[PDB]
Amino acid sequence: HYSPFKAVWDWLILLLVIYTAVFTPYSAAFLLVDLIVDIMFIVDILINFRTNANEEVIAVHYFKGWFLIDMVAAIPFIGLLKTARLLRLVRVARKLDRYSAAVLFLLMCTFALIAHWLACIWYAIGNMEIGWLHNLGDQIGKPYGPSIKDKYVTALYFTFSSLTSVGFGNVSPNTNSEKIFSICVMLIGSLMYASIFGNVSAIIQRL
């Protein structure tokens, strides 16, 4: 567990799991390359196979430590049922002494992630039917729809604003489902802002 190879390959699977977490929710939400991350995530299990509290040291371990989780994570087969891919996030779950100025990129990454997830949730809501998308259609010169890029960037925009507590006013919740989601995103924004943006301050302080 102390090799000049384990480190580089672990950071490689880190980049690959960020790939997963950034491109499965978008894909599943908006419009619902990856075989290589499949191959690396199924090489990770065997890399555990080839690599005690009191002292130093493997196969039945995963049979009881973490396998069925990883099995339902990566297993081929409705196009919705791909959501279970997100289970791969657990790969960033149990290595947190060999992942942590890296914490700063991690914090920016997770903030952007939460913004992305809330953006796609917001898109699902606004597409489950006065709302917001009938409005975004009218703001820009696209009345009726808009291109997928316009929708995604406006969703990420509104989510990022109402998270950072600005509220530009071009995008405004106007239906009880939207308003309840807004109360929830404002709760999450209060909590996450208060925690992580004092966190970043303390990080830059100790440096």
Binding mask 174-203 for a copy of itself (x = CB under 8 A): xxx--xx-xx--xx-xxx-xxx-xxxxxx-
Q: 């925009």: which residue's tokens?
A: 157
- Binding-site partner at residue 3 among K ion, a copy of itself, none, CB < 5 to 8 Å by type: none
- Straight-line distance from the first to the last Cα atom of the chain, in angstroms, rounded to the nearest whole number: 28
DSSP assignment letter at 53: -
| Among positions 58, 114, 160, 206, the unique one binding a copy of itself when judged by CB under 8 A | 160
Phi (first) and psi of residue 66, to 5 degrees? -155, 85
Q: Which residues contact 203 (CB under 8 A, 6 or more apart)?
A: 103, 104, 107
The neighbour count for residue 188, using CB atoms within 10 Å, is: 14
In whole angstroms, what is the distance from residue 27 CA to residue 126 CA? 17
Binding-site size for a copy of itself (CB under 8 A) equals 48
165 is a contact residue toward K ion (CB under 5 A): yes
Between 77 and 144, name the residue whose CB sits nearer to a copy of itself.
Answer: 144
- What is the DSSP code (8-state) at residue 167? -
Binding mask 58-97 for K ion (x = CB under 5 A): ----------------------------------------
Sign of CA dihedral 172, 197, 18, 101: positive
Binding span for a copy of itself by CB under 8 A among 17-25, 27-35, 73-81, 155-163 = 155-163
Cα 203 to Cα 207: distance, rounded to the nearest angstrom: 6
Residues in region 16-35 near a copy of itself by CB under 8 A: none
- Binding residues vs a copy of itself (CB under 8 A): 108, 111, 130, 139-141, 149-150, 153-154, 156-157, 160-162, 164-176, 179-180, 182-183, 186-187, 189-191, 193-195, 197-202, 204-205
- Binding residues vs K ion (CB under 5 A): 165, 167
